[PDB]
Input
Amino acid sequence: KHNMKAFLDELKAENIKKFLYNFTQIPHLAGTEQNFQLAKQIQSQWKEFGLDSVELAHYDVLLSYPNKTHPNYISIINEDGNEIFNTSLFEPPPPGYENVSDIVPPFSAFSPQGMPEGDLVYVNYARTEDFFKLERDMKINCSGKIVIARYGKVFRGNKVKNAQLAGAKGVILYSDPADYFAPGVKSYPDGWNLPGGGVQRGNILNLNGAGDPLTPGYPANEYAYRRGIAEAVGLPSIPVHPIGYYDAQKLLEKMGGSAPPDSSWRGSLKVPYNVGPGFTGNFSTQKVKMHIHSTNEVTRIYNVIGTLRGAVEPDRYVILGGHRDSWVFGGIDPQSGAAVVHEIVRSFGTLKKEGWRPRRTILFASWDAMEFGLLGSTEWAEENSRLLQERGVAYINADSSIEGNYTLRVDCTPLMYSLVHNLTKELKSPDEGFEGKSLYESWTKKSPSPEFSGMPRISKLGSGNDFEVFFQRLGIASGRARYTKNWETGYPLYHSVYETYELVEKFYDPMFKYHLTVAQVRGGMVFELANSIVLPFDCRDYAVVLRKYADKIYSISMKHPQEMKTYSVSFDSLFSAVKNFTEIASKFSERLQDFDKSNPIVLRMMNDQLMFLERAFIDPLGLPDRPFYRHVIYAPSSHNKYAGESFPGIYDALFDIESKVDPSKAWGEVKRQIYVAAFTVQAAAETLSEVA
Amino acid sequence: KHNMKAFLDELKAENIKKFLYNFTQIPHLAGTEQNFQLAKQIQSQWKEFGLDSVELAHYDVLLSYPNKTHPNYISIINEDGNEIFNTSLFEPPPPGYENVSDIVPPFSAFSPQGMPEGDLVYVNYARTEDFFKLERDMKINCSGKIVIARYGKVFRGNKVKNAQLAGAKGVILYSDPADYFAPGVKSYPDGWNLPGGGVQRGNILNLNGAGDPLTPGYPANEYAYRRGIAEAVGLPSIPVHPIGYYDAQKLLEKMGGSAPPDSSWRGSLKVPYNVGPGFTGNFSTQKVKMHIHSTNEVTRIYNVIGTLRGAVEPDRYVILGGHRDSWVFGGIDPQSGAAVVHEIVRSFGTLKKEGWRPRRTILFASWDAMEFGLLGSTEWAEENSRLLQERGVAYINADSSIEGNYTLRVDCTPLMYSLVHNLTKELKSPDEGFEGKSLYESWTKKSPSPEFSGMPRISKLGSGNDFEVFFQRLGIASGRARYTKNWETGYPLYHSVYETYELVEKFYDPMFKYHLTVAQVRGGMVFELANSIVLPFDCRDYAVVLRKYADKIYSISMKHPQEMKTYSVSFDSLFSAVKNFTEIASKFSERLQDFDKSNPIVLRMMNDQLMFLERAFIDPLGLPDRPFYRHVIYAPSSHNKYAGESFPGIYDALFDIESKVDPSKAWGEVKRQIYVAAFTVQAAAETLSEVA
Ligand SMILES: *[C@@H]1O[C@H](CO)[C@@H](O[C@@H]2O[C@H](CO)[C@@H](O[C@@H]3O[C@H](CO[C@H]4O[C@H](CO)[C@@H](O)[C@H](O)[C@@H]4O)[C@@H](O)[C@H](O[C@H]4O[C@H](CO)[C@@H](O)[C@H](O)[C@@H]4O)[C@@H]3O)[C@H](O)[C@H]2NC(C)=O)[C@H](O)[C@H]1NC(C)=O
Ligand SMILES: *[C@@H]1O[C@H](CO)[C@@H](O[C@@H]2O[C@H](CO)[C@@H](O[C@@H]3O[C@H](CO[C@H]4O[C@H](CO)[C@@H](O)[C@H](O)[C@@H]4O)[C@@H](O)[C@H](O[C@H]4O[C@H](CO)[C@@H](O)[C@H](O)[C@@H]4O)[C@@H]3O)[C@H](O)[C@H]2NC(C)=O)[C@H](O)[C@H]1NC(C)=O
Ligand SMILES: *[C@@H]1O[C@H](CO)[C@@H](O[C@@H]2O[C@H](CO)[C@@H](O[C@@H]3O[C@H](CO)[C@@H](O)[C@H](O[C@H]4O[C@H](CO)[C@@H](O)[C@H](O)[C@@H]4O)[C@@H]3O)[C@H](O)[C@H]2NC(C)=O)[C@H](O)[C@H]1NC(C)=O
Ligand SMILES: *[C@@H]1O[C@H](CO)[C@@H](O[C@@H]2O[C@H](CO)[C@@H](O[C@@H]3O[C@H](CO)[C@@H](O)[C@H](O[C@H]4O[C@H](CO)[C@@H](O)[C@H](O)[C@@H]4O)[C@@H]3O)[C@H](O)[C@H]2NC(C)=O)[C@H](O)[C@H]1NC(C)=O
Ligand SMILES: *[C@@H]1O[C@H](CO)[C@@H](O[C@@H]2O[C@H](CO)[C@@H](O)[C@H](O)[C@H]2NC(C)=O)[C@H](O)[C@H]1NC(C)=O
Ligand SMILES: *[C@@H]1O[C@H](CO)[C@@H](O[C@@H]2O[C@H](CO)[C@@H](O)[C@H](O)[C@H]2NC(C)=O)[C@H](O)[C@H]1NC(C)=O
Ligand SMILES: *[C@@H]1O[C@H](CO)[C@@H](O[C@@H]2O[C@H](CO)[C@@H](O)[C@H](O)[C@H]2NC(C)=O)[C@H](O)[C@H]1NC(C)=O
Ligand SMILES: *[C@@H]1O[C@H](CO)[C@@H](O[C@@H]2O[C@H](CO)[C@@H](O)[C@H](O)[C@H]2NC(C)=O)[C@H](O)[C@H]1NC(C)=O
Ligand SMILES: *[C@@H]1O[C@H](CO)[C@@H](O[C@@H]2O[C@H](CO)[C@@H](O)[C@H](O)[C@H]2NC(C)=O)[C@H](O)[C@H]1NC(C)=O
Ligand SMILES: *[C@@H]1O[C@H](CO)[C@@H](O[C@@H]2O[C@H](CO)[C@@H](O)[C@H](O)[C@H]2NC(C)=O)[C@H](O)[C@H]1NC(C)=O
Ligand SMILES: *[C@@H]1O[C@H](CO)[C@@H](O[C@@H]2O[C@H](CO)[C@@H](O)[C@H](O)[C@H]2NC(C)=O)[C@H](O)[C@H]1NC(C)=O
Ligand SMILES: *[C@@H]1O[C@H](CO)[C@@H](O[C@@H]2O[C@H](CO)[C@@H](O)[C@H](O)[C@H]2NC(C)=O)[C@H](O)[C@H]1NC(C)=O
Ligand SMILES: O=C(O)CC[C@H](NS(=O)(=O)N[C@@H](CCC(=O)O)C(=O)O)C(=O)O
Ligand SMILES: O=C(O)CC[C@H](NS(=O)(=O)N[C@@H](CCC(=O)O)C(=O)O)C(=O)O
Ligand SMILES: *[C@@H]1O[C@H](CO)[C@@H](O)[C@H](O)[C@H]1NC(C)=O
Ligand SMILES: *[C@@H]1O[C@H](CO)[C@@H](O)[C@H](O)[C@H]1NC(C)=O
Ligand SMILES: [Ca+2]
Ligand SMILES: [Ca+2]
Ligand SMILES: [Cl-]
Ligand SMILES: [Cl-]
Ligand code: NA
Ligand code: NA
Ligand SMILES: [Zn+2]
Ligand SMILES: [Zn+2]
Ligand SMILES: [Zn+2]
Ligand SMILES: [Zn+2]
Output
């Protein structure tokens, strides 16, 4: 039989292992020849695996690279201007790769050039609340200072934005062992911990969903008109560079000025964690000097797009996509995901060769330049936006398959909660102590829902991955799944040269059983979405979460009862819309289960109602000053791109409102956001009403 | 049989006459009790006629009314401040209506209050080119002057915007007999000409598609947050008032300063048409003083929405809509259209009572507050935007059925050209000298295509009517049809108290045969759109017009050959996209005619490709500073809302470019608009490619 069981049984751990090894022997940095060669390889293999068509979609986008003959580094300088300490020019390469060419040294992609000299201020994680504490409570002024911040907690672009708005003239990012060194585990290559010479790469853009900085709204094709750099979206205005903790120790050890305000500001290095500004009395005349010479360059990138045409609804698209470009070897990020996608294509192709076709079209994507701002997925979606918004059923992401070996982690739209519960009940747990038990059972046990006994945790989609354009801009139901660590006990070698095949094979998943389980979850989800007669979405699950989010946003507002009285701030409209959504979704579910099952139009009709429900939460005017974040329920946090925020428009209107100079205007805007949210929820509910 | 013939034969001239009489006995001004009563009447009658549901959709929108106890008027004042001439406080009411209550006196809706005193400048039609001539050629300065402008040529809101930007402190609008008095025809009530005491009402907003000035983007429902007046969209900043030509004679006769620059600046009054500024030497110390006391008020409006549920595709909507609100009696505008809609509903209801149903759902709308800025249609479409953009097949407008008795006038999307040609070949010409011949034959003879021998003229959609939100904001295929005058030989009594049932019955259409013909065209179009198995759109007709528009915009640019060389301005991408559109549409047409006719999915698929083709020309970012004009091919002219402009983004980038101070920046923006247009055309073409 050709059913989901046939598809799932065909997936093999050993194939994922072979593919991972194959994709991780050399660096695949976006815009390089090596990454074009791998694109062409994947194109060829997807054809052989049996897809109907496989094309490269290329774009010319702004990328960023260090100058090979003018290295980036940081110095301590004395009053003579002698550089008495210099940070490393590269990470010590791992065993057996000390002769690999074209390893890009650690840098912050899209940093401007500069050689700023100044006194250091230590800003903890450089979060919004960290700068509030510095400025408001401690009365420390970052204006004209170089800030040093530890990685962690929030996306690094938000740290740089926060540092900029505090008036910093430069940012040094470093990995603190408190955040990137698990107690009792050995450093690479003897364990999975970050060594002191390890450094996390990564872009520091604030794109807010725009894609290529030079072509917001439109694909960066051959005839594109590009903005000048001065008008580009999202570029930092101050120099930025990342370092490891050996180097960070040398910059922090001399820090004077104020003491850390409390213990949440101290990492694990043998230093005081003084906030500064500047060094202690003896070294008070030494300063920190950055040297950044990286250049921004328009460079060609290549997405691989494979199509498996649907037998019945060829004009309905289920998309499985993840990126291919890596900072260096990409042993976890992204090749642990890409190898899983490759094995999924191979399985689907096996069934197709035997005469099977999915009901709906499946599109498979190998995205480029994800590490430089989600550029490949975003430019392709800008090119194909009309096809995607009228035909896109769902998008399943496929970055790193593993970030630990403890349990499953799923982030998705509420529309997929039921699908995920049902699929995981069918799958075998790969976990020790759960042999012969379902993935649902092990997952629920290890990651209980905070709300419901007997169910597992499923999180909101945030951002920082290739689902962003599909979900937050276009309103296509999206989901992701991977294996994760026990958060009670990211990963230490994230975006370092040490992320290698050997890291995965030795320390994370020697038997490739977690990879296989993630292939089963991602592939199983795609199979159902592409093959179920009725789309496998449950609108009632959206109604439940909308009430939770309405309760939450109301509670935030109600911390200001006087102002709500003074400005007549009511949430009644939003609760009314949520109540209506609950009632209409209940009735729609009855019709879906009860409609005449022989009628394909009532079924195309009701499948269209299911497909366009996520779409209904899109506001074509976007959120304030963020035109490409259009989903009214979910946006990336304005304080942390990685985190999702619910009712983001109301949330941002309320954030720090007690500090606004004109409360009447501020609370007016809260009321405006309540109106927009209530309207959008009611409008989405009405898409599920009887159509005429 | 239940076919289009059955539908068409059921329509009766005598019923349209009875309905017109019924709808025109009392004024139906938006926001008044009389207009609510008529809404309730139409709701009741549409139910009795047999529609499945008929509801009122109400909104609370900004309207504008004169102060009943503080009348608007204009004076000439002497240096003592005696008012030696005053304009009329009302139009002399027509015979038999001198006792009708609640006739709103002539006013310019949305004028601010004020009593500005100054010297007059005469600005011809107050068009962009008229102000260019005043300022650039004649060196006349309007700053701090009261401008007097004759109605005609362009929408009055554009005149007021132009006057404002010239620094005018007030605007007087008047009807010149050159533009509103046909030679050899008698004034009302003895003929169809405007008498000297007649005045044209009308709003002077510049909404650019926004709808209610206080709630752009969102319906003005019960919980709406409204902008303050200071932030409202589209309101004029200087006082404005309309007058007739008896009064205009008194204001113009004393005008001094410069002579008219040529004969195109002189109307038909016995005055010099001096541009001013100010009066001749003897009267040089007299000034003009406006007194405007109208108030803006949020007021409830009511749309009637009737539904005839489709038998096969209930989730596909064909909409027939036109407005119900009038300035006074609405004898032509809009009741000649509303009576036609009423008879169309009655016919459809007759077939429905006999057991018939259309294939797709038909929605019928009686819009409110159209005269105050398309407010009723726009607020309803804002409320229902998600349903309309995923389910809207087509919108057929139904304002005034007649503006003359000469021949047919059709403005529509190219997608409907074939439908209109084929339907009119089936219909009987009502014209004298064409008995027994088709409407197509009489129409082609009297209104030949400027491009193609043997075919009739069909114009682009402009704006200024209720199709605007559906077509230019949401991208739903739209059309309109009415009987019109011979443009070789609008209508004189437009928006005056003299627009009555008697005007129509005596002078325009005594036998109601032109009304019946227009009912046949509008109803026939709705019938086909709602009933044809394959939607009756021909994508190849879009390809033909896109090449015409590309040629036209290229020609405009090529008036600047040096600059095109200097800034490397190429139209190659746009011609390439148009060529591709032509090729793909040709192949799609072959599949449509050749596909397996027994396959309803290939048919729903290909019907969806046809429905979403107009949708593909929408840019979600809108046009520059006009977020609600989103169609890249068609926008209302930025110089005249009534006129359509093709490739509006490129057109506006090129307009008056030789006057821009920074040519590099100006031509950069031309290139950006070429990129956006070429991309959008290619993207629309790709929606017609095979789907997978
Ligand atoms: C959740 O779902 C419910 C429906 O189950 C919606 O209920 C609607 O709520 C609105 C209030 O926001 C009601 O609006 C009121 O309508 C009255 C007229 O309604 C009748 O006629 C209309 C046609 O015009 C029909 O649509 C309707 O079926 C009724 O037959 C108005 O008279 C009311 O205005 C008066 O009172 C208010 C309040 O004091 C004043 O501000 C006004 O000045 C005026 O005096 C009012 O506008 C509406 O009738 C309800 N529809 C129903 C019950 O079907 C909720 O709105 C929805 N929630 C959201 C967020 O959309
Ligand atoms: C109208 O329809 C036609 C298709 O019939 C489109 O034609 C495309 O035109 C673009 C130019 O805008 C061509 O782009 C060129 O692609 C080359 C690679 O193409 C091959 O491989 C790709 C995958 O990456 C496949 O998609 C494709 O099928 C080919 O197999 C590039 O090498 C070219 O770049 C080089 O030359 C240019 C020009 O000098 C330089 O600027 C670059 O630096 C580089 O050296 C170029 O990008 C594309 O191949 C054409 N596709 C075809 C023929 O199928 C038109 O674009 C379309 N019109 C519009 C407005 O969309
Ligand atoms: C995840 O799995 C759960 C559990 O299987 C699943 O919920 C179940 O879905 C089925 C199918 O819709 C439900 O069965 C329906 O029950 C009602 C009431 O008993 C019946 O009226 C329905 O009968 C109609 O449809 C049948 C075909 O399904 C026809 O055979 C019949 O002639 C009728 O037309 C129907 O049997 C069942 O109640 C639920 N169980 C629950 C909710 O506990 C859920 O849908 C899955 N989630 C997905 C797929 O996303
Ligand atoms: C306006 O009217 C014109 C004139 O009637 C109309 O164009 C015509 O449309 C018909 C129907 O599509 C065309 O007929 C087709 O001709 C091709 C080539 O000869 C045939 O291959 C097609 O046959 C297929 O489809 C038939 C059903 O229509 C089946 O019976 C058959 O088995 C095949 O599947 C088909 O007969 C005809 O060529 C044109 N005439 C022209 C273009 O001159 C136009 O569509 C109308 N516009 C509308 C409705 O908007
Ligand atoms: C990854 O696997 C691919 C596919 O097997 C290898 O590419 C093949 O290389 C052989 C030998 O050079 C060629 O004959 C084939 O034409 C290639 N197939 C392709 C590109 O489709 C590739 O060598 C492997 N990479 C590594 C690093 O081992
Ligand atoms: C990268 O840095 C190198 C080395 O400093 C730069 O190459 C020099 O450029 C200057 C002019 O800008 C020349 O006068 C030198 O002769 C060059 N030196 C070498 C070693 O080639 C180069 O400008 C930088 N590359 C960039 C900005 O991409
Ligand atoms: C840090 O690196 C800098 C730059 O390479 C070193 O300073 C240079 O040293 C050479 C020879 O001693 C001088 O000729 C250059 O003029 C110096 N350049 C600058 C910018 O200072 C410095 O010696 C290094 N410091 C350490 C501790 O190795
Ligand atoms: C932090 O220090 C800078 C000075 O280095 C302050 O920035 C000044 O702001 C005032 C106006 O508010 C201007 O007159 C100065 O020109 C600014 N200085 C420069 C050179 O930019 C800033 O106000 C301080 N932050 C505090 C304590 O609020
Ligand atoms: C327009 O026609 C309507 C419908 O016939 C008339 O309204 C009817 O009036 C009669 C007598 O007052 C009532 O018995 C009916 O209930 C009304 N029908 C409705 C409102 O549906 C109306 O009087 C006519 N208007 C004019 C000006 O003649
Ligand atoms: C319309 O004009 C009338 C008449 O001038 C205004 O009514 C007067 O309002 C003032 C205060 O604004 C009172 O002191 C007078 O007693 C009122 N007179 C009358 C005749 O009632 C009224 O303000 C205006 N209405 C509006 C603005 O809608
Ligand atoms: C034009 O109308 C104005 C306002 O009604 C008239 O001027 C008023 O006349 C009365 C009595 O003569 C005075 O008490 C008022 O003070 C006047 N008001 C103003 C604002 O001037 C004027 O007489 C009328 N002119 C003509 C030609 O009839
Ligand atoms: C038309 O006349 C007005 C003066 O009445 C001019 O407007 C002035 O513009 C200059 C700056 O360009 C300012 O200094 C004045 O304050 C403005 N006047 C007022 C009172 O607004 C205008 O420039 C003239 N137009 C021409 C001839 O270009
Ligand atoms: O540019 C972006 O939006 C992010 C690009 C890249 N995305 S990622 O894959 O490396 N981010 C993690 C987020 C880490 C976490 O929150 O656990 C992920 O999605 O796995 C980065 O953060 O540099
Ligand atoms: O607010 C608007 O956009 C226009 C409202 C109203 N529309 S209209 O129906 O009166 N305009 C005419 C345009 C007259 C013409 O161009 O022949 C029409 O569409 O018939 C008006 O112009 O005041
Ligand atoms: C793999 O699982 C074991 C058992 O809990 C754990 O001790 C080890 O740290 C895990 N490896 C990684 C890389 O998380
Ligand atoms: C009606 O048609 C006749 C014949 O051409 C024409 O003379 C007359 O002016 C028309 N009436 C109107 C109102 O246009
Ligand atoms: Ca782009
Ligand atoms: Ca509105
Ligand atoms: Cl992922
Ligand atoms: Cl019309
Ligand atoms: Na493109
Ligand atoms: Na609403
Ligand atoms: Zn990454
Ligand atoms: Zn990644
Ligand atoms: Zn009108
Ligand atoms: Zn009208």
In short: The first strand of chain A starts at residue 53 and ends at 65. Chain A touches chain B through 53 residues (CB under 8 Å). The CA atoms of residues 327 and 675 of chain A lie 44 Å apart.
